Amino acid sequence: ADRIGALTIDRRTPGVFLPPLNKGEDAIINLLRIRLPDEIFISTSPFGSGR
Amino acid sequence: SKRITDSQVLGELGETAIKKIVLETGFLYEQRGRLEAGTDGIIELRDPKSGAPLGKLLGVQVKSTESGQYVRENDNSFEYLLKPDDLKYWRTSNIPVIIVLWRKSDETAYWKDVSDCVRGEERRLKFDKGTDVFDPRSADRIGALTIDRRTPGVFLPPLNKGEDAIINLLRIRLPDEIFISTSPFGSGRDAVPELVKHGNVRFDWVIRKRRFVSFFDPREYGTRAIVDLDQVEAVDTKLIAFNDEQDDLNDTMDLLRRTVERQTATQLSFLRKDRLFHFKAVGVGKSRSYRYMSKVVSAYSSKKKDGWGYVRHHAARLRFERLADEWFLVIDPDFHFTTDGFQPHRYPEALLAGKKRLERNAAVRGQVTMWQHLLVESGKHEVDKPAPLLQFERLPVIQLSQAVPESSWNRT
Amino acid sequence: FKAHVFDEPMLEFGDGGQHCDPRQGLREHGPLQPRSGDVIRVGVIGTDDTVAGFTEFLAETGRGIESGNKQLINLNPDFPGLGNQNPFRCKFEVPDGATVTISRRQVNDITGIGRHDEAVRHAVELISSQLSALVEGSAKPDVIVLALPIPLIEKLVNAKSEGEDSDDDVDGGDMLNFRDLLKAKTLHLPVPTQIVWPDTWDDAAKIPRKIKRDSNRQTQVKATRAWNLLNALFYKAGKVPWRLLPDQAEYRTSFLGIGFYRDLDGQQLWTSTAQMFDERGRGLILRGARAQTETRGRHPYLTAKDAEDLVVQSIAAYKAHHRHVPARLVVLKTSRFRSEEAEGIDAALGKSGIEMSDLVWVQESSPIAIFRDGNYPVLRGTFVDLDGKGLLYTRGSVPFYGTFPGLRVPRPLLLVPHENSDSTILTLAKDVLALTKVNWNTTQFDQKLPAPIKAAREVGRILKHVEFGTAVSSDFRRYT
DNA sequence: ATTCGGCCGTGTACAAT
RNA sequence: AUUGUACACGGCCGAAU
DNA sequence: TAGACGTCGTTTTAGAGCT
DNA sequence: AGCTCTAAAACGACGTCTA
Ligand SMILES: [Ca+2]
Ligand SMILES: [Ca+2]
Ligand SMILES: [Ca+2]
Known part of the structure; x- marks a missing residue:
């Protein structure tokens, strides 16, 4: 009975x-990602450089 | 004192009916004995x-019911609720488990996978009355459960009994006679202005090697100077159409094309640069729609689109083939583009590519069916006017x- | 019109294992001809960026690449890797010292050339010298991969020359093909060469189109690219991946495909041939040869004596392996068989004693088609007998794939046998359909054209640049 | 010139409903 | 040119006037 | 000690019930 | 008008009263 039941254990x-395998160590970066808005506004102010 | 209630008889009848349906499909059905639990068969x-x-x-x-509506039954679908222990037992098995509901009053069977639960509910199955019918047509879907x-x-091999597909060929019924004669001119290019000079004009004739071939009688129309009247003769079409000579075949094909062009001049128009029969537009910047039977449905042959302006007309490169001593017309759907409905649209590659790319099998089948219907209807007179010379019939449907x-x- | 549907022809892999899909068959049973040694030394030529880039892709394929579309797992299967399910039972390694680097100065030398034709010819000479160095040394690669850089591709293919097209100012026509010219000029080298663009081994890299400058090229998923690329690499290494499973009781037959190509001037027309037959054992031989005649012209058909010499060569090539003339000779041509051609074929067979022959014109320009009811086309293998002319659907819905891998309704083949033919059209279509699955340039098994016809056209591309009378290798590995 | 047949070559779009 | 199909464009050929 | 009557197990559909 | 238990039938042996 036990031997027969082992057939259906799959x-x-x-x-x-499984892609990954044996791995040694991990680390993180101080770098951080930025998402940007999908719109920017440009013009020509009567001023030179904001001074 | 022994009694067999109608419930047990009805359940056995439902099991037998489901087995009969399965055997009609072509599969094998095995009925489980007394020790069955949560599975009526395999x-x-x-x-x-x-x-x-x-x-x-x-x-x-x-599960069989003599009559009575299911839960939230309507014309399009209904709902069913499973027992929890049955669902657990079905989930702990190793083969797909389906549940089939059999109603005796209307003799209907509806099947569904027990794991196909309604979103957010474990034990509710929403049977679609249109797609969940248990019959041979569903066989493939049932097979889809077996494979992971x-x-x-x-x-899995295709498990359906068969299918039906149409061909684009239309069988031509040639007239029993053909008018053959001599002519002053060996080429019809010089003869065309002579016909234009005379009274009646119709382009349903071929001049190949000083011989004049036509379906209509040249005498009865304005094609008088084109042909030597003394040598006009009418002979059996088997001596011109069904033979082995090459130039006879070429003249037959050209005459058939011109006859189709004249016969379908009401709806179509010919483009000689591409040999394209495109649906002519009635009025500049005015549209047209066509109604055909396949069940009557309308296909919209001519479409403008805004912007600078381009007009798409349905078209076909109608060609001719001779198989087994019979003549067939081959329909090849395509599109033509015009700036205003008459003047051809220069630079049509982008529009043609865009229209062709999104076209699937169903659209092409619809177009070829519409063209077949148009050419079949154009061959009927229904009288005053001369009867159309060419009559096209649909080939018997092909069985796969x-x-x-x-x-x-x-x-x- | 009686219609028939052929079941998918059976393919043979590994230790006699059978499967109807090259990808799954390789995964289960392995290649038909096992490789002696578990490493396939692959040489790489290109810039240090591309050489290093392609090197890790070969290692990446060893680790395993996930499927690009989980919805259709049969059409877009994952690349297994280096485990038990390795498709080729071997490792694609780039051994140390088997790489040649194209210097940035060398690339600038090719790019700086103004005329497109002169740049291509100069580039071919440069790469040919590097290829000679690779095979002269101790690297001993089995197949050499040319990983072209992006700047080279723009000049050689897209004809980009610093913004302005000086070659187009000359208004020349039919610009030289770098790939075809390169393969012709390296036929004398003993190692087959494979050209690989960065798009295949790097999803990040983008290559703009030649005319549509804004648009980039679109490629298959990475797993599919690895399946097709490595199979070509394995075949070019010298081992046949799979073979059609042979019927026990069938006539010993050799298939000969005949094609035509232009003479680099756009007017004349030569004839290129391909021969396919079994190797008296588990193998399958696919040769590609040009007619030895010199009857120049523009006719896309053979003459009386020229067609006779084509069969004589094919019989001799078959006889060199089996030591006996074939029982059946099936000839597939891209143009209608004429009376002079057929009597030329018959004369060669009479001199050799071949019993049965079939002369089939494989035509793709046929307006005849059939349409089922639904959103999908007819099944692949659907056949309609149109009065001695076979309407074969080599492309269509594939039950194994679960879809139809095409863009529009597929266009069927029209098989038009000549009068001097032996086999019935039903058997000829079954043979033609089977031949479409043995094209080793790809792992997808629904090809429109049979292999002898497909191989004949591929041979014509390379032989367009080979001067007549120059003896070249007939192995198809040098052309695919 | 036409009418009938056909073929080979270079590009883009797409990964399949 | 990983791979082929579909489409578009172009060139050309065979038979008779 | 015999011996129905009972409880326990399942399927099978269908009802009165609380909702 | 849905669920859900609840009735009603059958078979399969097996304690439990009930004498
Ligand atoms: Ca049962
Ligand atoms: Ca039941
Ligand atoms: Ca290749």
Whole structure:
């Protein structure tokens, strides 16, 4: 009975592939990402450089 | 004292009816014995063509009702509620489990996968009365349950009994006689102005090698100087159409094209630069729609679009073929573009590519059916006027032993 | 009109394993001819950016590439990797010292040339010298990959010359093809060469179109690109990936495809041929040769004696492997068979004793088609017998793929056998449909054209630049 | 000139409903 | 040119007037 | 000790019920 | 008008009273 029941245990995974493998260490960067608005406004002010 | 209530008889009848439906489909059905629990039977798939069982099983639970509407039943769909223990047992199995509801009053069967639950509810199944009917047409979909779409390399042969597809050929019924004669001119190019000079004008004739070939009688119209009247003769069409000589075949094809052009001049117009029969526009900047039977539906042959302005006309490169001593007309759908409906639209490559790219099989089938209907209707007189010379009939519909599992491809 | 639908022809992989899809068949059973040694040494030529870029892609394919479309897993399968399911049972390694780097000064030398034709010819000479160095040394690559950089592609393909088109000012026509010229000029080298653009091994890189400057080129998903590229690399390494599963009781047949190509001046027309037959064993031989005649002209058809010599060569090539003339000779041509051609074929067979022959004109310019009811076209393999002329649907809905991998309604082939033909059109269509699955340039198995016809046109591209009378290798690996 | 047949070559769009 | 199809454009050929 | 009567297990559909 | 338990039928042996 025990031997027969082991047939339906489905030892094989349902066709899943695992990209990653053995890895040593991890780290993070001080860099941070920025999202930008989809609109900018430009003009020609009567001033030179905002002074 | 022993009694077999109508409920048990009805349940057995429903199981038998579902087994009969499965066998009509072409699969194999196995009925479980007394020790059944949560599964009325097992369906095994079988290839309709080779008859080879596919070894893929799926459990089936059949619930039968004598009559009475389901939960929230309407004309388009209804709803059903499962028992929790039954759902748990179905989920702990290793084969797909379907549930089929069989109503005896209207003799209907509706099937659904037990795991296809209504969004947000575990035990509700929303049966669509149009697509969930249990019958051979659903076979492919049932087979789609056996295979796991996640694992690669697994597939299933087409499980439908067959399909029906049409061809674009239209059989021509040639007139029993053809007018052959001599002529002063060997080429019709010089003869055309002579015909223009005379009274009646019609372009349904061919001049190839000083010989004049036509369907209509040259005497009865203005084509008098084109032909030597003494040598005019009418002979059986088998001596001109169905023979082996090359120039006879060329003259037959040219005469058929000109006859089709004249016969369909009411709706179509010819473009000699591309040999294209395009739906002529009535009035400059005025539109047209066509109604055809396939069930009557309208296809909109001529469309302008705003901007600078371009007009798309449906068109076809109608050609002629001779197979098995019979003549067939080949329809090849296409589009023509005009700046104002008459003057051709220069630089049409972008519009042509855009229109062709989005066209799928259904659109092309609709276009070819519309063209077939137009050419069939143009061959009828229904009387005053001369009867049309060429009559086109649709070929018998082509039967295919296998069908595309389109019903299972709605969400690929 | 009686219609028929052929089941998908059976392919043979690995240790006799059978499957109807090259991608899945390779994954399960492996290549038909196992490679001796578990490493396929691949040489890379290009700039240090592209050489390093392509090197990690080969390693990336070893790790495994996920599917580009989970909805259609059969049409866009994931690349397995280096585990038990490795498609080719081998590692694609770039061994140390097997790389040649195109210097930035060398690229600027090619780019700086004004005329497009002169730039292409100068580039071919430059790459040919690098290829000679790669094979002369101890690197010993099995197949050499040319990873062209983006600046080179713009000048060689898109004809970009510092904004203004000086060549277009000359108003020349039919600019030289860099790929075809390069393959012709390196036929004497013993290692097949593969050209790879950065788009395949780098999704980030973008290459603009030649005319539509704003638009970029669109490529398949990365997994599909790896499947097609590595299969070509494996085939160019010298081992046949898969073969049509042979029926136990079939006539020993050799398929000969005949095609035509222009003579680099746009007027004359030569004839290029391709021969396909089994290797008396598990193998499959695909040769590509040019007619040895010199009857110049513009006619897209053979003459009496010229067609006879074509069959004599094909019989001799077949006889060199099997030591016996074939039982059946199937000839596929891109143009209608004429009386002079057919009597030329018959004369060659009479001198050799071939029993059965078939002369089929594979035509793609046919307006005849059939349409089912629905949003999908007819099944691939659908056949209609139009009075001795076969309407074969080599492309269409594929039940294995779950969809139709096309852009519009597919255009069927029209098989028009000549009068001097033996096999019925039903059997000829079954053979033609099977031949479409044995084109090794791609792993997708629904090809419109049969391999002998497809291989004949590919041979014509390279041989357009080969001077007549120059002996060249007939192996198809040098042309695909 | 036409009418019938056909073929080969270079580009873009798209990854399939 | 990873891969091919569809489309568009162009060149050309065979038979008879 | 025999011996129905009972509880327990399932399917099967259909009703009175609380909602 | 939906759920949900609740009736009603059958089979399968097996304690439990009930003498
Ligand atoms: Ca049952
Ligand atoms: Ca039941
Ligand atoms: Ca290739």
